[PDB]
């Protein structure tokens, strides 16, 4: 009974979920109006792929 | 000094209509472009309506849509406007001001400069409930 001693090249593959939730950067860049510098608008982004 | 006294505020029933005024003194009416604002208690100042110095644009804000009639009288140098179909969202403090003087700051120059003229600010409440 003989050990392997048989070299075979190997490839590499990565696999992930598609996107399924895009961070809404459209809502903060392509908007209609922004606040004044003294009353700067703020938004929180979390739980999304940026 | 230049003054802009605001008046005409009060609690009004929703769906009604009221009016308020701004008496301006210390400058000629035609020099400056005049207008009003609105201050929600928890949000910053917003522009609602404004009158051209001559009366060319007299532009408004689509937030109030077509529920406006602004009118400035030169003899008294006084600005007027009214609300129709009152709704609670209109509840806010409305101020009066005149433009024309804006700061001129050159690249890395001097930020100190002339500024516009503001008013006093009168509160307007819209609600379907009565008052004691």
Q: List all residues of chain B from 35 to 94 with a beta carbon under 8 Å from chain A.
A: 43-45
Under 8 Å between Cβ of B21 and B78: yes
In the 8-state DSSP scheme, what is residue A38?
G
- Domains in chain B with CATH codes: 3-127 (2.60.40.10)
Interface residue A40 vs chain B (CB under 8 A) = no
The tokens for B121 are 């600010």
Q: Is A44 exposed, middle or buried (CB count within 10 Å of its CB: 0-12, 13-18, 19+)?
A: exposed
| Experimental method, per PDB record | cryo-EM
* C-alpha pair distances (Å), A29 with each of A25, A34, A50, B1, B46: 6, 10, 14, 42, 21
Q: What is the CA radius of gyration of chain B?
A: 16
Number of H helices, E strands in chain B: 0, 11
| Cα separation, A23 vs A32, whole angstroms | 18
DSSP assignment of B104-128: ---TTS-------EE---EEEEEES
Backbone phi and psi for residue B65, each to the nearest 5 degrees, phi listed first:
60, -130
CA of B83: how far to CAs of A14, B13, B19, B39, B62, in Å? 62, 12, 6, 15, 13
Give Cα B127 to chain centroid, integer Å: 21
Spatial separation of the C-alpha atoms in residues A2 and A13, rounded to whole Å: 31
Residue B92's H or E segment, with its range, is: strand B92-94
Secondary structure of residue B12 in the 3-state scheme:
strand
Q: Which residues pair with B25 in a beta bridge?
A: B3
Please judge whether A36 and B44 are an interchain contact, meaning their C-beta atoms are less than 8 angstroms apart: yes
Q: Quick check: helix, strand or coil at residue B94?
A: strand
- Give the CA angle between residues B127, B39, B19 to the nearest 5°: 55
Substitution target in B38, B40, B43, B44 with the highest count of A β-carbons within 10 Å is: B44
């Amino acid at each position: 009974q003989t050990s392997n001693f048989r070299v075979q090249p190997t490839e590499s593959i990565v696999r992930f979920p598609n996107i399924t939730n895009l961070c809404p950067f459209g809502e903060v860049f392509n908007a209609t109006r922004f606040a004044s510098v003294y009353a700067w608008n703020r938004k929180r982004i979390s739980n999304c792929v940026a | 000094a230049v003054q802009l006294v605001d008046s005409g505020g009060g609690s009004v029933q929703a769906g009604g209509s009221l009016r308020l005024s701004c008496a301006a003194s210390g400058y000629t009416y035609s020099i400056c472009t005049m207008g009003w604002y609105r201050q929600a208690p928890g949000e910053g100042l917003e522009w609602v309506s404004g009158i051209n110095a001559d009366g060319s644009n007299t532009h408004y804000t689509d937030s109030v849509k077509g529920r406006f009639t602004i009118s400035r009288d030169n003899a008294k140098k006084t600005l007027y406007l009214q609300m129709n179909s009152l709704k609670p969202e209109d509840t806010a403090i409305y101020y009066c001001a005149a433009h024309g003087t804006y700061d001129k700051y050159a690249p890395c120059g001097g930020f100190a400069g002339t500024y516009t003229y503001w008013g006093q600010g009168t509160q307007v409440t819209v609600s379907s409930s009565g008052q004691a």
